[PDB]
């Protein structure tokens, strides 16, 4: 599917093939002593096993680049025990709880955030929510009597619970960073 390339021309997030397996580069960094051929030592992950390696290649290696799928999808229902996801040509993606890390703690009926999901060959990768999301506060205390100068718990719809701002009101909107699990912002 794509040419390929030099080591040197890899970072991370980038797939090589490697033996006929797809590993993921998570740390990329070379090396040049003086006028010595240059190397690029890379961390790897392989996406069919979960095997961590990290090995040293001459600068000029060719690997072959391996292209992962990528769909946007939102979130259908929960058949059980498996996550059903669809895009927007209606196909559907059953899911495993395995696979759902990040978004599952901000999974909600009906929830319309468009997620990014991402295949080799028909096998989940990764489903990531976007970077900010909104939430509707289910319940919260009111705020307490008494300060020196912060957050309080809330409850979400389904049943997360976050520290959010103490000003916050059951019924309020929150923004949430998704990339922390954090609360940002009142809406």
Do not use: H
């Not at 998570?26 to 096993?49: D, P, Y």
């Not at 307490?144 to 000003?167: I, P, W, Y």
């Amino acid at each position: 599917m794509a040419s390929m390339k030099t080591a040197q021309e890899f970072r991370a997030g980038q797939v090589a093939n490697i033996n006929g397996a797809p590993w993921v580069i998570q740390k990329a960094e070379f090396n040049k002593s003086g006028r010595n051929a240059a190397v690029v030592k890379m961390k790897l992950k392989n996406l069919l096993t979960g095997a961590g390696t990290e090995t040293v290649f001459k600068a000029d290696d060719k690997l072959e680049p391996i292209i992962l799928d990528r769909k946007e999808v939102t979130y259908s229902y929960f058949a059980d025990p498996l996550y059903v996801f669809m895009d927007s040509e209606f196909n559907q993606y059953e899911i495993e709880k395995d696979d759902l890390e990040g978004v599952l703690t901000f999974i909600e009926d009906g929830m319309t955030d468009i997620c990014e999901a991402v295949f080799y060959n028909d096998k989940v990768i990764s489903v990531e929510l976007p970077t900010t999301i909104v939430r509707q506060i289910a319940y919260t205390e009111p705020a307490v009597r008494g300060d020196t100068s912060v957050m309080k718990t809330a409850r979400l719809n389904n049943g997360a619970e976050l520290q959010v701002s103490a000003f916050c009101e059951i019924g309020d909107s929150i923004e949430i960073d998704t990339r922390t699990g954090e609360y940002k912002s009142r809406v």
